Design a protein around this nucleic acid. Structure first.
Ligand SMILES: [Mg+2]
Ligand SMILES: [Mg+2]
Ligand SMILES: [Mg+2]
Ligand SMILES: [Mg+2]
Ligand SMILES: [Mg+2]
Ligand SMILES: [Mg+2]
Ligand SMILES: [Mg+2]
Ligand SMILES: [Mg+2]
Ligand SMILES: [Mg+2]
Ligand SMILES: [Mg+2]
Ligand SMILES: [Mg+2]
Ligand SMILES: [Mg+2]
Ligand SMILES: [Mg+2]
Ligand SMILES: [Mg+2]
Ligand SMILES: [Mg+2]
Ligand SMILES: [Mg+2]
Ligand SMILES: [Mg+2]
Ligand SMILES: [Mg+2]
Ligand SMILES: [Mg+2]
Ligand SMILES: [Mg+2]
Ligand SMILES: [Mg+2]
Ligand SMILES: [Mg+2]
Ligand SMILES: [Mg+2]
Ligand SMILES: [Mg+2]
Ligand SMILES: [Mg+2]
Ligand SMILES: [Mg+2]
Ligand SMILES: [Mg+2]
Ligand SMILES: [Mg+2]
Ligand SMILES: [Mg+2]
Ligand SMILES: [Mg+2]
Ligand SMILES: [Mg+2]
Ligand SMILES: [Mg+2]
Ligand SMILES: [Mg+2]
Ligand SMILES: [Mg+2]
Ligand SMILES: [Mg+2]
Ligand SMILES: [Mg+2]
Ligand SMILES: [Mg+2]
Ligand SMILES: [Mg+2]
Ligand SMILES: [Mg+2]
Ligand SMILES: [Mg+2]
Ligand SMILES: [Mg+2]
Ligand SMILES: [Mg+2]
Ligand SMILES: [Mg+2]
Ligand SMILES: [Mg+2]
Ligand SMILES: [Mg+2]
Ligand SMILES: [Mg+2]
Ligand SMILES: [Mg+2]
Ligand SMILES: [Mg+2]
Ligand SMILES: [Mg+2]
Lengths: 95, 239, 158, 14
RNA sequence: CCUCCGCAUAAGCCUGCGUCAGAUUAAAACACUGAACUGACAAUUAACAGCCCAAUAUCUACAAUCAACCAACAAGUCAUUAUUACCCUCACUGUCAACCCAACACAGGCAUGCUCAUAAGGAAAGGUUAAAAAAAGUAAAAGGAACUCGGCAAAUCUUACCCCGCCUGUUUACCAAAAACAUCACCUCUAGCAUCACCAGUAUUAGAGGCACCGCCUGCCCAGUGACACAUGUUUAACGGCCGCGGUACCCUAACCGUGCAAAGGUAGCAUAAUCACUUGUUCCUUAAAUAGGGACCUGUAUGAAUGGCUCCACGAGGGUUCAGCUGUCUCUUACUUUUAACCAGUGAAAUUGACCUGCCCGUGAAGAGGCGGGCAUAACACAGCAAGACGAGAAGACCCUAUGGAGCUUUAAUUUAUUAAUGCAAACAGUAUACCAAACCUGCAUUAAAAAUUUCGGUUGGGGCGACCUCGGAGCAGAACCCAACCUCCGAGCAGUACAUGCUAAGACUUCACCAGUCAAAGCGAACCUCAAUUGAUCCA
RNA sequence: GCUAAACCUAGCCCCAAACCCACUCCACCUUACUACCAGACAACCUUAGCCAAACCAUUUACCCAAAUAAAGUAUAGGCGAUAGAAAUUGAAACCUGGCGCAAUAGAUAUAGUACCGCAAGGGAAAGAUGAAAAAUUAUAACCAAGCAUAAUAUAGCAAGGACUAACCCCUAUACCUUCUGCAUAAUGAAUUAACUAGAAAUAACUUUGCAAGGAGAGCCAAAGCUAAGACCCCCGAAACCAGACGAGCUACCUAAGAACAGCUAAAAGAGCACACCCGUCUAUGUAGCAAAAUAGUGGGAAGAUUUAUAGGUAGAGGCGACAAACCUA
């Protein structure tokens, strides 16, 4: 991911991670199950509904996605009409 | 690569000029034609291939006289210096040409056919149908280029109105203008295909290296081609 | 001298292709110089000449960054010198034609001291400046006798 | 093939 | 005593065995003092070969080889004329040597003349003794190749037979010098022709290819490739190919017929051969004894007619055998001389070295112990010879295997024609009664035969290729929660017989030992009141 | 105590400032280090390649306009390993050193010297007494690897336990590593002296400071922000391109020359055989005379033979009587 560039000497990110995932401010990444739009005629409606759900990642996957990004993608955005605004902060956490 | 040609003589003379061998070397120096190199030293003779040519302050026909028949190593046939007037020029010898012969170099085309011998030269417009000719030209006042080897000869076929079709030794027809001067008869030094080489020493003396020793697989061009006769090529310019 | 892909796609082979313009050996006629020249002209040049209404206008209006040729700059400099020096172009016995030619090309008229340095390269300019600033070294005897006569006049008139 | 290495001569100062 | 040497010319740094002092130290493989030196002294003087030629036009076909007979073929190494202007003259480079190229004072190499041994030039030996071993020389009672795979040094002087190649020659400089490449004879294809080789040539020529003389001959084919005509064809001395079965009277080896295919179903010749294993073939000879050699046979199912088949005139440092005569290779070795060997005088290595106070047997260990266990063995130190061991010295093995590390060759493995010749289109010129003709030279698009700009060649394989497999489920190994492999032994699956509420949300769990994936379901709105075991496909893009 | 150990100066690297130079006379474009004579032709051109994506065919900062935040954002990319701006607030003239070194360090340098090839090119150590060397004095010695002074004395990985004394008595299988297992007969080593091998981001841990704000503009924030400390090796291949060099050995060609006694000479790309061209075999050595030699047995030696001189054909090639043979061991 180029830890040191040749012009600015900073850290670069992977645009695939940004285009395929979505990081929340709490420290979770929202992904999408693969194969949710291809070959839907041989799958049961239960599987079709399960594939169309925002599934969270794990620990090592979240750590990898954080290491592949810089400090810009780990901030807090205040959009006007953000459907994921209620998922930024995570309450009722006891270790 | 300082490669300069030995053809540095813009004036016709009689003394044999020394020639330099090449061995397949052009101006760059790389071998481009294989099979040439290493031979006996030879001297070049300035051979005048143009038969009819007027002298200084001359225009009409002139007589000649064969002196002595020699040999030319630069070609297969032999040459013979023929004197006449106040100059001597080398011309190609013909069959049955010895010392003390008399030949004519005319140009006035006649109404009827002239029954010339096999030594003199006359334009194709005065020669009978079916005559063994040699050293035929292509353009009026250009020079003899076709049929110049040893024993090669051509036979007149037909006449139209201003052309003359000449049968080439390759059984191919070729027409030319009527005002072209061509010799009559066959070239001397016959029986050349019977020259048994006997040993590679003769080929090394002539200046021919042996062929390549690589085994080349014959492609599709090694088969016999039974092809018809190509059409007659015309040199007469028509507007 | 650029590069062209195979079937107009970047997922193939990158080949190199060099385009060449078309050359038509034509013949023109300059009215300012009154002499015909054989120039292997192309098509865009002919179009620009037709749009500029003649060859002299196309040469005098286009700047140095448009001709991209030394002959064009030489022709421009020659026309400028001919229009500035007012030298007889054709010949006497008919000055009306020369007057009309000079009046047709009157929207420029570059002075003589500036038209001689139009189109020249750096080496040619240096050579011209050296030839103008040549001047054989004057003997010091003249300067010495001048200083001497000046000093004697200054000491005598006082 | 015919493998062979050429010897190396030292400078004439030692 | 040798002279297989030397003197000059040619090439080559130019002072490199003349004197003087130092010669204490420093280079002689040791010394004197000097071909492996420090400083000073000056050699070589040209007549030797060079340093060269005032122009304008023109002239130069009857070789050399004692050149006089003769005789040729590879057709050849030497010459002037008319005119104009020019009467100043001897300058320059080296003349030494014991010498050059190979790291050297190297048993290597160097072109021509001179007497081919002389009038040039040098010393195989430092001394002491005669150890073993090795190398170079003379011969030997009897056998003369009986030893060795093979006549392998050697001296006598040596005949015949077979294969291969026509011959001379040349090729792997530095392990193969050959049957290997070439050579005249033959055959195939291409080209109607003027300036830079081809060629200052003309279809008895030139270029591109296959075998390689003389004697007998080259029988067939365009279904497949290429080439030529675009007339569906021609080409094979162009790439290549010329059957099987059944019936066949006593025995292999058949006359003949039927059947299916196709261009023909092996022609001539020759041989168990340089010729797949059977093959040490029948048999004769050469020896008393012969897979060695010659002669007549093809089931040669894999010889074969220019990938040419066989004898023949001559020949081969090519590969094999033998006859009359002889060489210690042997039975069975020996007599002498030199190099060399042992000691004395000095210069004086290279490979190699973890340290050694370093014996043997049995047994054990990373599987072959002088260093481990039990025994045997033992005052110490040098010289002179052999190899049994220390898996001894030289090359990170050239043989086997791995590598998403390379390179060479050939394509009908992949991107493409970047450069030609042919094409069709568009612009560029000019005539032409609503039509045709598109010449020479530039530009862009797409195609065809040669070059090419780049690349890779998957995995397990009781070492690798060949044998077998590449995804998933079930039965025993794994027996009663769960998981567990094998190139352990078996069934299978890449789907189906019928309604689309096979609609939308939403607590809780299992999870093929991780992840990506898959499955069950509380309840509500909506509606009348799902079967089988594996049964399959993600990112990008469209 | 012999061999041999230390003695600091030519200076060496980067900053700030400053823009730095080029004939005493002769010779220097032909055989440079040459005084003197008749065709004037000579440049104007996408660089490529390695590596990476575990291959590789698209792609891979290097492009010569001062900082930073934006921002590694939109974008380009077999949409993947990677590459990467712009719009925008902005960027305080002048001061002479080394928390670098001292000959195996620092430029290779006292020097681009010797040496290697025809050639481009490669290319290394040097110098230590002293105020008075016009003080040739008497001292300053003492430490590593090699030696004598002063050899060995039976037994054993060289060591330990020990006693009045070295041995004698008992125990005990060198060092690091790929390896389950190594002193194993696997790898490395003769010693001494000098030199040589863990360089760093997002995210983490600890400690000061401030605080709903922290921070010397930009950034973050539902207890946060700033600063400091802490951390990620060396050497070793075959391959490819670009710019220049070679036919003086060897392959081929070109111009002018030279060489071959004697006998049989059948007329001859005939035979034996001198000098000469090449080397089929035996024996000698493989750190030799020699990084390819020594005698004969060898083939040719009137021609497809050898050789002195000069020139040309060079790597995406030259040449080739085709050995993938040769192109300076
Ligand atoms: Mg031929
Ligand atoms: Mg051949
Ligand atoms: Mg002399
Ligand atoms: Mg040597
Ligand atoms: Mg003498
Ligand atoms: Mg002696
Ligand atoms: Mg001796
Ligand atoms: Mg005897
Ligand atoms: Mg025997
Ligand atoms: Mg013998
Ligand atoms: Mg032969
Ligand atoms: Mg050899
Ligand atoms: Mg040779
Ligand atoms: Mg040999
Ligand atoms: Mg042959
Ligand atoms: Mg045939
Ligand atoms: Mg057989
Ligand atoms: Mg025998
Ligand atoms: Mg021979
Ligand atoms: Mg001694
Ligand atoms: Mg052990
Ligand atoms: Mg044992
Ligand atoms: Mg041992
Ligand atoms: Mg190895
Ligand atoms: Mg692999
Ligand atoms: Mg690879
Ligand atoms: Mg590669
Ligand atoms: Mg390559
Ligand atoms: Mg494998
Ligand atoms: Mg196996
Ligand atoms: Mg699980
Ligand atoms: Mg329900
Ligand atoms: Mg890579
Ligand atoms: Mg900007
Ligand atoms: Mg230094
Ligand atoms: Mg240095
Ligand atoms: Mg010591
Ligand atoms: Mg003991
Ligand atoms: Mg260590
Ligand atoms: Mg290892
Ligand atoms: Mg092992
Ligand atoms: Mg060991
Ligand atoms: Mg090993
Ligand atoms: Mg060792
Ligand atoms: Mg040469
Ligand atoms: Mg040759
Ligand atoms: Mg002969
Ligand atoms: Mg002979
Ligand atoms: Mg071959």
């Amino acid at each position: 991911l180029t830890y040191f560039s040749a012009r600015k000497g900073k850290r670069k990110t992977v645009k695939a991670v940004i285009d395929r995932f979505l990081r929340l401010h709490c420290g979770l990444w929202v992904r999408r199950k693969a194969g949710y739009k291809k070959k839907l005629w041989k799958k049961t409606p239960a599987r079709k509904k399960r594939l169309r759900e925002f599934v969270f990642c794990n620990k090592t996957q979240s750590k990898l996605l954080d290491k592949m990004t810089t400090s810009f993608w780990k901030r807090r955005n205040w959009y006007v009409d953000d459907p994921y605004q209620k998922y930024h902060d995570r309450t009722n956490l006891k270790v | 690569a300082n490669f300069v040609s030995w053809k540095s003589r813009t004036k016709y003379t009689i003394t044999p000029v020394k020639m330099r061998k090449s061995g397949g070397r052009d101006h760059t120096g790389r071998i481009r034609v294989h099979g040439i190199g290493g031979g006996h030293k030879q001297r070049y003779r300035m051979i005048d291939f143009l038969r009819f040519r007027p002298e200084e302050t001359k225009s009409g026909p002139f007589e000649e006289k064969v002196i002595q028949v020699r040999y030319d190593p630069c070609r297969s046939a032999d040459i013979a210096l023929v004197a006449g007037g106040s100059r001597k020029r080398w011309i190609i010898a013909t069959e049955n040409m010895q010392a003390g012969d008399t030949i004519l170099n005319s140009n006035h085309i006649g109404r009827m056919a002239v029954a010339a011998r096999e030594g003199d030269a006359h334009p194709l417009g005065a020669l009978p149908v079916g005559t063994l000719i040699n050293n035929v030209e292509s353009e009026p006042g250009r020079g003899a280029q076709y049929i110049r080897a040893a024993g090669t000869c051509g036979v007149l076929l037909r006449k139209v109105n201003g052309t003359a079709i000449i049968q080439l030794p390759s059984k191919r027809q070729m027409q030319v203008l009527e005002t072209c001067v061509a010799t009559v008869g066959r070239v001397s030094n016959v029986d050349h295909n019977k020259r048994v080489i006997g040993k590679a020493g003769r080929n090394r003396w002539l200046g021919k290296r042996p062929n390549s020793g690589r085994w080349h697989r014959k492609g599709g061009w090694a088969g016999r081609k039974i092809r018809p006769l190509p059409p007659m090529k015309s040199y007469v310019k028509l507007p | 001298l650029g590069q062209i892909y195979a079937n107009n796609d970047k997922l193939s082979k990158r080949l190199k292709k060099v385009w060449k313009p078309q050359l038509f050996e034509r013949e023109f006629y300059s009215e300012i110089l009154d002499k015909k020249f054989t120039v292997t002209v192309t098509m865009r040049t002919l179009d620009l000449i037709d749009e500029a209404y003649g060859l002299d206008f196309y040469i005098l209006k286009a700047s140095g960054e448009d001709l991209c040729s030394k002959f064009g700059m030489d022709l421009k400099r020659g026309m400028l010198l001919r229009l500035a020096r007012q030298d007889p172009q054709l010949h006497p016995e008919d000055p009306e034609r020369r007057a009309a030619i000079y009046d047709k090309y009157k929207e420029f008229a570059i002075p003589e001291e500036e038209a001689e340095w139009v189109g020249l390269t750096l080496e040619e300019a240096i050579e011209k400046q050296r030839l103008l600033e040549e001047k054989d070294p004057v003997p010091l005897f003249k300067i010495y006798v001048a200083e001497l006569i000046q000093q004697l006049q200054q000491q005598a008139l006082s | 093939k015919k493998r062979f290495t050429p010897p190396i001569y030292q400078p004439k100062f030692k």
